[model samples]
Target chain A: NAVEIQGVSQRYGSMTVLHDLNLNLGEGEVLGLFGHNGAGKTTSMKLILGLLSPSEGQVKVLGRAPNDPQVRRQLGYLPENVTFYPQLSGRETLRHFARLKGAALTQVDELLEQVGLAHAADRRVKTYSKGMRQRLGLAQALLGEPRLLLLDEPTVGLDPIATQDLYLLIDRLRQRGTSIILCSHVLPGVEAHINRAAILAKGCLQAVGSLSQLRAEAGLPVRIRASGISERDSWLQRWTDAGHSARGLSESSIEVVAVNGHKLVLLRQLLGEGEPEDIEIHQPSLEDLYRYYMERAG
Target chain B: MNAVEIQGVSQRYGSMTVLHDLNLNLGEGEVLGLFGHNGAGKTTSMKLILGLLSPSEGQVKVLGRAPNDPQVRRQLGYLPENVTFYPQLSGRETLRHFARLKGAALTQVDELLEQVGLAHAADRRVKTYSKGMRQRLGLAQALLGEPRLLLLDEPTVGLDPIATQDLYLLIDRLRQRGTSIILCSHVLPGVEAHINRAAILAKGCLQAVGSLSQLRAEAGLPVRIRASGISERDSWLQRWTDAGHSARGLSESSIEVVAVNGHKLVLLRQLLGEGEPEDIEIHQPSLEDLYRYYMERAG
Candidate 1:
């Protein structure tokens, strides 16, 4: 496991923030840590980073203690609101962190090039745009290809170009076998990038599994959309007879909602029966599952 | 005749050009989405269509008349940001003022406010309202006279999800009444389905103009087919990835396979032949995706 927390609980002077939470992040997997407004995602990240001591039980990462100095050098964390020395240029800023993270000075320019910022490397951080600053922050995070990276709300305030660029770098990091803890309040450019997710609610570990696993367990419907299916084919009757919910869109197409298991079976049934130009299966999104589970926890 | 026609139009601010060689059209009751980066001439085009600015070259025609024509002004409405909106007046007063100025009926004031979900706050001054409320008032004013050609600039800004839906629903109502609309927005998904055509501009030059499907056909990117299944399909899934598709193991005994175009149909057939997986999904390049793809080549 890239990160491990076992039966950990946290309590302040009177208020308890976390309750016996067990969560883990595996290598090469991006864990989308989600919760309601205050269901303890921030506190959980703090616990994993060893910023606070668990009131009970143990927290271990990389087969070592959370606060171990040995672990510090191997970890890279990107804060949500990244601030930098205003005067420091991208190259200078990267070098400062590279030396701090015990990286080779020769690798500084190479890292800048990797982030596609070599063109603007000498410009001061203050002169950089939002996307440029994001690239610099990412380069800072990928120093020496650390074993793990923690990015908090990394997609915030990014335009479409900036966002698409970040997703590529995140994907490249995953390919480089870097485990990451990607946290956000709601799903924003994270659903497909994440490999697994853990939902915490009301200071309790609500669920943890691969996205598909949690999705299947939640039992949300998979919508089958058809473009101009046989309106005269009594498709609605066929759908209801098979115990599925169906409707005709205002247009000529039809949409059917499938139950939990055997979703692909339903797709096959529809695809085989209809001679439509296109038939598609739309699974419940990460947002839908998150909404369902969070509301249930409430 | 088309609802609007911009024929080889261009606008210049002294020596600097704002728009050049623009050819665009909008059908009656059609929703046209205008997209561009900053200073890419969206605002300049809107001004020309509204008769606020004369084109430095070529011509613009709205409702078969010059945009400056008083008849055209009466039939056209533009929703601008509240740059200098009156603050002392309540929402009701605000709509009433617009109705009096536009010479439309004052009787539609309360109904306009109600349609925009601001009836409860109809008595509150503009200064007391939030950004969302102010936007609703702006839209309500634009809706006052049933303008034949409505121009909305970032109309959904500051609106909550439900409020955004209500705005689009009102747009639907306007369309059914044979109104032509030109909407400019940054984020694309919410406005993608509503628009009948797209006009993407870059650096004051027209980059692309077509329906989304036409653009999709022109771009020729694959419509991806994705499936999640038990490990039993890994035999073929391995082959899928081996043949240069995306096949990744989600977790132990569960794998995801992505195949495009020709490969997808075969992959779908083979997967249905075996024990089914958890789910399958299809995705095309959305408007945002198309925008990005085109813009990369747009310049």
Candidate 2:
């Protein structure tokens, strides 16, 4: 595994955030860390970067302590809501980060070109659009050819084209055996890309695995959307107790985890009790799986 | 007559053409969504329409008059994503000041403030308002003179969902009154909801323009189905698998059945109908799906 968190616990002053959390990421694996606001997603990244020390347990990157310079040298992290000096241009800011990393060659131009920021390289950050700033952040993250890249909402404010560009870049890097962990609130987008995901809630590891494996273990259907699904809420409970789990997605949708559609007839029967507006069957997305996992963990 | 019309519009900084030969039309009551990467000329297009900068070659018309022309300026209003106005001035005072600049009555300020849900906060200084509240004030400023053409550039960038919904609904109400809008946003989902159509721009040119359905038809549909509590239906897939069917389950019970021909879909539907289960969906192509089709078409 490229990343390993063992029995980790953390606290700040009087508040305890994470407790006995554990997770592992393999080489060339792309893991998404999912959580809500103040769910310790950022805190976990900080711990991995050695920016913060955990109260107990061990955190390792590439089989070494996170703070070890050898490990740190191979990692690049972009903070959520990144901020930089507005007066500095993209090229200048990138060059500064390169200098801080102590790399000698002028790769700033190449990175800018890769991220489609070459046209805006000389423009002041203050004048650049939100998407442009995000591209600049990407350039900085790629400064030292990181083997394990950590991105927190890296696509925030980026337009669709840039978002696609970032994904292509990440995919290429992953092909070269780089492990990536992207933290984001936009679940469906990440689900389309990532190889694996970990759900964290209230600072604890709620569920962690390949999305499919988690679904099997959780016994929840991959995708289900319905209208007036709340009417069949109790019927869904029976599916769970019978070793088949189901989730109520919204007022109109209940997703059941079964081997096939044969179980869906029960929904028709349940709906006959009250007219349903819509029923949709969809492949399970990482978002739906994450939602089910986290809600259950809670 | 169009609420906004651009003909052969081109912009340059010295020698580099930021926008070249861009042509677009927005009629009254139409919501036009714009998408592009940075430097794709989205902002340049909006600025040109707002008359912030004049095009070097062609013309921009708003409300049937040349933009920036005295006759059209009063009928157009714009709200930028990152908004700030005279922090030292009160909200009412600021609108009043802008009112005088537009050569309109100051008495209209309170009425505009009320419309934007800022009447009670009118006496507060601009500095005191939260990001969302300040955006509301910026919106209030734009509603002055009751604009017939509205241009919003990422207007709900920092707002929460409720405020964003409120702003979208307000725009919808304005659209009912025949107000034309050119909305520039990176949030694809939101844009999909309110836009009548969208044009994808990249590297200074338009890539695709059409309704969501037209785009979807061009992009082959992706099938997504999920359900549970149906073991009998699950067993039917085993026959296909034994015959080496290209189907795999992301989960044990929840599977992604791919390469199922139309007849196979019909068979699967029957099997599904035979069972007692919950939650089933078949996805239609969405805006993202269509945009992706165009993008892949580029390749």
Candidate 3:
């Protein structure tokens, strides 16, 4: 396992911020930690990074304590809001971090290039845009070839194109056997990239599983979409008659919600009716599952 | 009759032009989506409309009066991207302070807090509030006097799903009450659903402006078709390609194709007459698609 948190509990003064939480990440696994504001997500990350010692339980990375000096080179962390010295150029700042990590100074240029910051490496950080500063922060976290990465809201201020670039970089890092814990609220953007998801609520682990497992457990219906047909009510009637919940998205498009077992039967009926302009089977999204788990936990 | 009007406006800072001879208007009770990347004149436009900065040339009007006129300020509400409050103050305290500044009654403080769903946390200090709560507080302040026009910049930045839905519902309420809104953000999917129309700004220039459907018609992109359980995917694939349509098989079990505006009917006919695949789907180009199209064209 690349990372592990066993029966961990954290407290700040009299408040128990995190309860007996347990999580694990294998090599190359990307675990998405989701929760609303004031949830234990950030505290959990801090505990794992050795920024805060757990009140109870063990947190380990690569079979070593997180704060062990020897393990410092193997960890990378990007806080939700990252700040760097504004006077330094991107290259200089990266070089400083690399040196602090005992990484080779020669890797600064490569790191800058990897994050798409080479073009602005010579410019002062003060002149960089929000997206540019985010890229620089990402480059800093990537120093020392860390085996475990903890990224909190990595794409907060990024444009779509820049977000795409960051995820591609993350994908490459994952392929290299790096374990990552990605905390983000942009469910759709991160849904496709993560291997497993863990939802937190009220400082406790509410649910954790692969997307399919969570959907099955949550028992949310799958969506069957149809388009390019008039009298959407007729199709609506057909679906209603079939004992499924259905609604029209627009004049020509209708969405029918059926359980997994009922999806095939519903699809056949719609396909037999006539070829609509479109038909699609959409499983419950992460957002749906997140809402489900959050509400259920409450 | 409109809420705002900017005619032949240009804003320059030092040697750089931020906005260039731009003309725009906000009609009463309209939600206009202002979209752009950093330094793409979105902020500049907001500043010009709010009268925070004067245009180097041309004119800006708010309710038939100059934007800088004292009377116009009372009718406009602006929420900046990063909304801050006195950390030492409670939610109710902050609202009461703003209410006093706006000459609103203290009774309006409780009403505004309740409106933003912050009644439960009304007594909590600002320092203890979450990012979402802070945004709600900011919104409550913006609603103090029931202004006719609201300028919201990335209001959903730290909001969760439920809060987002509530914000939209409030926006709908405000719009129904004849309030105009100018929402600026890069969250395209959410923005597409709320705004009555969209305005794309690129390099300080207006690239496109219209309802989504109008923009879709103007872009003229193809509609995507995805189907599964076809009888010999390659046979249909070859037929589609031979007929000059772009089609490809997906993992061998299905086929996905795109049909342009004029070719949709022909494709639909062929689809209806065909081997009757178990599944078929058509998708219009999304806002994300349209955004990229306009961005590329502007370059």
Candidate 4:
């Protein structure tokens, strides 16, 4: 495993911010850490970064203490709203971090261009916009080609193009056997990228598993929304559960809710009948599952 | 329109142009999504309209006067991307503080907190609040006195799905009351359906600005159609290909094809005549698709 947290608990003052949490990340796995504000998602990231020691249990990165100097060299972290010195230019700041990490000289040049900062490399950091500075921060995380990368709200200030680039970069890193922990409030957008998700609620690890695994575990209903079926209620109700129907004058919908496997029958029947103009299969997304688990935990 | 009118506005700081020549209007009860690359002058344009900075050239008229006019300033509200609050102050105290600064009535404080879903956390110190709670408090501050114009930058940043839905519902009510708004965010999929129009910027230049359909027409991107069939008679692939429609089979039973605007009806009628497929989805070029097209074409 690239990372592990065993029976860990973290406290701040009188409050317990993390319960007996346990999580694991294998090589090349991209795990999404999801939680509401004050759910301890950020604290969990801090624990893995060795910014704070757990009050109980173990936290390991690459099978060693996270604070170990040798292990630290193999990890990269980009916290939320990274603040860097404004007097330095993008290139100069990158060079400084590269030296601190003992990264290659060429790595600085490569990342400056890699994150599309080559043109503005000479501009002072004060002149850089929020997105520009975010790219620079990302370059810092990519400096040493660390085995594991931790990103908190990485796309917060980025434009759509830059956001797209960040995910592509994450995928490339994942393919090279790098482990990643993506923390974000943009749950739907993060759905397709992660291998598994660990959800925290009330400072406790509420749920942890792949999306399909979680969906099945929760036994959430899959919604099949079909439009333009006009007066096809009787046929639709036969395949669906709970008599869900919406008949209208100009337009109509056949809304059905059923277990995941049961949707196959409904869908196959639709293919045979083939009257509805559009059929959208709505499975339980990460956000849906997150809401489900969080509500239950509360 | 009782709203904004900016004509040929150009702003600069020292040697660099922050925002180039631009003209746009916001009608009463309209919401416009302002989008751009970082350093693309989105923040600069927001400043110009907020009276924080004077435009280097051109005019920005807000509610029939310059944005700098005290009379006009009272009618506008702004919520920045990253919000900070006095940690020691409770959510309720923070609203009172903002109310005094803007000359808004403190009578609206409790209701404003309720509106933002912060009523339950009203007395909790800001330091103990999560990022989501602080964001809500910031929104409640902007909303004091029921300002006529609202400027929201990344309003949904720290919000969850339920809170996000609530914010949109609140926006819908405000629009019904004829409050104009300027929204900025990078989350295209979330903001796409809410805005009346979009303004796309690149390198301090307005690359494109229009309704979603208008931009789609300008880009002329193809529409995608995917369908699954249960036909025992024959292969739709050969038939579709011979009919001069571009198509490729995903599986033997389903096909993915491209259809432009002028060809949709002819293609749909032809397919329906042979009996409908299980699923026939015709996807128009979405906001994200049009955005990429315009941004790439500008290059």
Best DockQ among the predictions, by candidate number: 1
Docking class of 1: incorrect
For candidate 4, give the DockQ.
0.19
Candidate 4 lDDT at B245 equals 59
Stretches of candidate 4 off by over 4 Å are A11-14, A87-92, A122-124, A219-242, A247-262, A265-282, B5-23, B47-72, B83-91, B101-103, B119-131, B160-162, B204-286
Could you tell which candidate, 1 or 2, scores higher by DockQ? 1
Better structure of 2 and 4 per DockQ: 4
lDDT rank, highest first?
A: 3, 4, 1, 2
Clashing pairs in 3: A278-B281, A278-B282, A279-B280, A279-B281
Higher-scoring candidate on DockQ, 1 or 4:
1
Indicate which candidate wins on TM-score.
3
lDDT of 1 by residue, B131-200 (tens): 6678788888787676998888878654544456667888898999999899877656557668888988
Q: Sort by DockQ, best first: what order?
A: 1, 3, 4, 2
Could you report the DockQ of all the candidates, in the order they appear?
0.22, 0.19, 0.20, 0.19
lDDT, candidate 3, equals 0.77
lDDT per residue (tens digit) for residues A224-248 in model 3: 6676775686677776776766667
In candidate 3 the C-alpha lDDT for residue B168 amounts to 88
Per-residue error (Å), model 3, residue B48 = 2.2
Compared with the true structure, what per-residue lDDT tens digits does model 2 show for residues B105-140? Answer: 788888888877888788888898766678788777
Residue A229's lDDT in candidate 2: 44
User: Candidate 2 on A12-114: residue-level lDDT in tens?
Assistant: 7857788788888888878988876464677887887887887888888788888877777678888766668898877788888888876555788788888
Q: Output per-candidate TM-scores for chain A, rounded to 2 decimals.
A: 0.92, 0.80, 0.93, 0.93
DockQ-superior candidate, 3 or 4: 3
Candidate 1 residues lying further than 4 Å off, grouped into runs, are A7-20, A36-39, A52-58, A159-162, A185-189, A201-205, A249-252, A261-264, A271-274, B1-8, B11-19, B23-204, B232-234, B237-270, B273-275, B296-299
